[PDB]
Amino acid sequence: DPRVINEQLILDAVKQFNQENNKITTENIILQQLRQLQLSFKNILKIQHLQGLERLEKLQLDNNIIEKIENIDHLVNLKWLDLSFNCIKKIEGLDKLKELTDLSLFNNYIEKIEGLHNNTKLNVFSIGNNRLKSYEEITLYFGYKPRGEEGTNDRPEFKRLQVLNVSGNPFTKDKENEYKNHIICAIEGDRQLIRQDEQISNSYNFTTTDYYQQMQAQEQKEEMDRQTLKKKKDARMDILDNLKDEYLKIEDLQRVKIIKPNQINEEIEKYCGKINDHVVEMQAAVIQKHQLILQEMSKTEVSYKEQEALHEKETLQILKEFEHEKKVEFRNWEKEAANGDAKKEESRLKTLLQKTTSLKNKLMDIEIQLVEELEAIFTDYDTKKKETAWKDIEEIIVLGQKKIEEENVKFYSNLNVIKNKEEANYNSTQQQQLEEENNEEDDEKASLLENKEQLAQMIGNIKETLIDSHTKIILSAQMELQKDLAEYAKQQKNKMYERNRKNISQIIAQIDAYQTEINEKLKQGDDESDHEN
Amino acid sequence: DDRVIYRSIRFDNKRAPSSQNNDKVFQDNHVGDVQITKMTQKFEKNPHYPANEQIQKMVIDLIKDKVIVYYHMNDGEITPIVKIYPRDSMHGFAKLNEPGGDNKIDDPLVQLENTKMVNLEKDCLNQLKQQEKIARDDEKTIREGEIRLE
Amino acid sequence: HLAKKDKLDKELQKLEDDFAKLKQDHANDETKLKTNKRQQQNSLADNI
Amino acid sequence: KEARAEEGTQQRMYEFEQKQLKEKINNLKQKTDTENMVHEQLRNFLIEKEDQI
Amino acid sequence: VQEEKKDHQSLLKIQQKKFDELINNLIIKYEERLAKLKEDLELKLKVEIHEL
Structure with missing residues (x-):
């Protein structure tokens, strides 16, 4: 039977998760103060009832029947993502989230990889056990393309991404482990081992030592350009x-x-x-x-x-x-x-x-x-x-x-x-x-x-x-220029105002504490004079 | 790395070799058995650990049997955070026998506070007995030996 | 929902203005007071 | 059942949204209390400093 | 004698400069590799946990 993740179900999931990690028994859980959400095996068929989580840092929806992804634009601060082993067929709707680093799409109907240009900072991506047809697909995400195809992607879109498994794909069962070497040449110890195979290094031209030298030069140029932009x-x-x-x-x-x-x-x-x-x-x-x-x-x-x-x-x-x-x-x-x-x-x-x-x-x-x-x-x-x-x-x-x-x-x-x-x-x-x-x-x-x-x-x-x-x-x-300088001066003076107010409040609090303690001492010393009559 | 830059242990000889506590029965290098009073500790301020959540000073005074812990002063603050906590419920010694003591122990906040305190205090205990042994070894070694030439 | 939310915010508008006026007035007071207070020490300074 | 489900979801998101909306006024009143306290203390401080100098 | 002592003292100062610069550059690159190894360790944990 199809279901929906409802705020009654939201509280149920919150309670189960808090039990799993011994979280404080607070029924008054602020719904605008959620960080990590686990929805283990709810057989979830659709994603709904989650608006307001721009601060999400961890989330899990594995072991469900979900099949479609979209509208995840409003959530752009996610970090830990796990949506694999579902009825997924396409990737989309996440074009606004750059901050994610753990992307799980393993064991789905995924056949086309698209929508990750914006999240260039991703480092973990699981899209294995799929129906993917071509290895060179993955090549498009690390600045390497097969020679002979007109490629307008002259700017690499994934550099820090060092977590990527697609093992078990249809084409991955042909010419064993050759496709992994080819992609890595376009893409940790396994990388060193593969780079040491003569055919693996011989069959391409754009290697990783030169790639990283060019990367350092390009990043230095980018930094100088950014400093020039800020200067101007x-x-x-x-x-x-x-x-x-x-x-x-x-x-x-x-x-x-x-x-x-x-x-x-x-x-x-x-x-x-x-x-x-x-x-x-x-x-x-x-x-x-x-x-x-x-x-x-x-x-x-x-x-x-x-x-x-x-x-x-x-x-x-x-x-x-x-x-x-x-x-x-x-x-x-x-x-x-x-x-x-x-x-x-x-x-x-x-x-x-x-x-x-x-x-x-x-x-x-x-x-x-x-x-x-x-x-x-x-x-x-x-x-x-x-x-x-x-x-x-x-x-x-x-x-x-x-x-x-x-x-x-x-x-x-x-x-x-x-x-x-x-x-x-x-x-x-x-x-x-x-x-x-x-x-x-x-x-x-x-x-x-x-x-x-x-x-x-x-x-x-x-x-x-x-x-x-x-x-x-x-x-x-x-x-x-006038408004910039004026706001500088105004912020400095006002902040001085709050600092003065805060210090005076602290002084008043300390004097009150001193007076209350002195009065306590005096009053107890004086009350010690009421048993002797 | 730990940022605890200052560490000291007060002493007072006003009580004899108390014969119960193993942790207080100390193989003091100097004379054998000695008795304990208090501890003080001062920590470095990590820019990324909050001052009101990161402890800068702490005092586990046995005579008072209550801990005197200092916290940094927030931006604009001149109210120093000198917290004097009770150590009655610090190692699980708290008496559940009293029906009536507001049972706020259920709060995991108290649990984490006490876990941190116990870890710090036992670590200091063992480190300081080890310091006793190491200092004994060092001073004996540099005492008994004669003079060597190169 | 829309009708009641709009009704809730009708008062809000006027409150804004009042606050603003008060806020602006507040600045004046400080400024005015500062003026007088400053002149005081100026007099003392000259007297000094 | 589905119709009632989305209707209740909209209702609950409406409690959320309208409780948010009836919050600008409360925040304004709180911050105006802040400003009034600050300004009254400022005026009293100005007068007292005037007196001392 | 005086001029050769001058030259030798100049050589001592030049070698001080050379080795101080060597030490400074070496420290800079070691700190760089310490930071890079920190990041290496975070994504090593990342890969381990994700694989499991």
């Missing part, structure tokens, strides 16, 4: 990436390209190249400024760390002094309680309590000095940043924006000159020939040239729109 973004000039793509957002440029395509493309290339080089110098200077600003900030946290540590060391020394005070006071308390001289005991105890209030006052004073020091440090650093780094970025952005403006103005002037020359050439030529195949493009050029004022206004609008878009992107980068 922190320069805030990333938004200008469409500046050279603006013309493809500028239709009037396409319309005007008809008049003289050759020199139009030539001037466009000159304009793009110069704009690119000077804008690049722009973000390079901005990057220097932002890097020194980052150093400024990091030294800010460093200085806060040293000064704070000084504060806690002084506070801890004073607190150790008062703990010694408490211990001597309690020792004398017990000694005189054996003595029973209540008057002197309570006198020394109020002496201690006044000392405790003194500790409260001095600790609050320490917090006050903390406030002065942190506030002065923050104001000084903010003024330093404003005076040097913020102003340098300001000037660099101003120079870069007006340099882009210089390029735009010169480009517009060159466009004006080319338009005037084309107009003059058309005016000269129109007086000799009046019949040539009624050319469509010739007629379009004639119409564009006749309305010379129309062309002038179109190019002027083109330049004004280009300058406006460039200026708006420039100001968007400037506002990005």
Whole structure:
């Protein structure tokens, strides 16, 4: 009989699992705080009633009649997966989960392997005991393909994957153990043993030593590219990436390209190249400024760390002094309680309590000095940043924006000159020939040239729109820098607020504990005076 | 690796060679039998083990028969975690004979706490008797020998 | 379900605004107070 | 039986979802209690520091 | 004598530099192999448990 994994069944499975591993008997098991789920042999026919488990780390559904997989997109934080030995025929629905590492699809109807490009980090995959037809299938997942097939997969999709068994597949019963060697040459001790067979190493060209040297080189290139990307973004000039793509957002440029395509493309290339080089110098200077600003900030946290540590060391020394005070006071308390001289005991105890209030006052004073020091440090650093780094970025952005403006103005002037020359050439030529195949493009050029004022206004609008878009992107980068710095300062100050609140709460709690303990000692010493009458 | 960077055992000679406890009948190198008072231990702070879940200091004081364990201070905290736990229910000595003691032992949390404490304390006991034997060997070896030349 | 969930959140809207206003007002108070307090020590400083 | 099964599943997911929805207001009230306490202490601290200096 | 002593002291300093650099590079690569062996052990446990 077909069934469903229901939340009543959910609780039943939770109870069985907790029994299996002696988990705390809590009926109030938070359903948003689930990590591992076992569903051993429920004969489960479908997967349902599991929404909300984005934090899942372990899961098991072996020994069931499940046959289809899909909608596992919402679960992207899974680690331990075991769904083998089911009615599976295809793999899909998991394209969003990258964090899984244990993939079990053993002993199913699996014949096509697909959907694991996103989870390149997988290291365990069981798809053995299947109906798989071709060995080279697996080759597609480790950056190796049979020679002679057009393969657009020039980027390997599985590197750390070192757990993979398909043993028992249909083709795996032919030419014993040759297919394993072939796949491994495209893919732990078994690997060393297979690599030592002469035919295994002779039959291919792309080995593992060279593969790993290339891997290290490629990963170094990737890391340098990522650092360059972060550099450019922190320069805030990333938004200008469409500046050279603006013309493809500028239709009037396409319309005007008809008049003289050759020199139009030539001037466009000159304009793009110069704009690119000077804008690049722009973000390079901005990057220097932002890097020194980052150093400024990091030294800010460093200085806060040293000064704070000084504060806690002084506070801890004073607190150790008062703990010694408490211990001597309690020792004398017990000694005189054996003595029973209540008057002197309570006198020394109020002496201690006044000392405790003194500790409260001095600790609050320490917090006050903390406030002065942190506030002065923050104001000084903010003024330093404003005076040097913020102003340098300001000037660099101003120079870069007006340099882009210089390029735009010169480009517009060159466009004006080319338009005037084309107009003059058309005016000269129109007086000799009046019949040539009624050319469509010739007629379009004639119409564009006749309305010379129309062309002038179109190019002027083109330049004004280009300058406006460039200026708006420039100001968007400037506002990005403004908001970034503002959020930095705001987070630092607010976090200082919560830190101050937390430390004051701790001080109040300790003073309250001291006072309550002192009162307990005094009250017991005094109550010891109520049996003697 | 363990991160327990400080380890010490208090002593007090105010009681004679108590004749019951094997763990307290110590083949002390110096004189034979000696008697025990307390232990202190200080641990390294792993960045990835929580301060309020990772013990930084601990005190198993026999005179008080209660353990004095310190925990790190959380970010922004100046309230030191000086927990003084009772050792009555530490080795299973807890009396189930009392009908009325709130039976919170069922909680596995108490079970894990006591398992950790017992493991640590017996490990220290055996390691320190071994330290006794090793120190005896070392000092006798460097005492009896004459002087060698190369 | 949709009707009751929508009804539950009708009040929410206004609460937001109130909180925001209070929050904004709070900032002002701190700022205002800081101003005065700062001037105090400034006076002392000059007096010093 | 299946019809009742999915109907009950939707009902229970509805208790879940609507208990979630009637939580923004509670969280807001709790955090506003937090903010009021923080601001009242801040104002009192400002006045007391004024007095001491 | 003085100039040859100068050359020998320079040689001592150069050899100090050479062997200190040798030790530093050797430590770096050993630590690298310790981390790689840690990872080796985690996926060795992974393969053992999955195979069983």
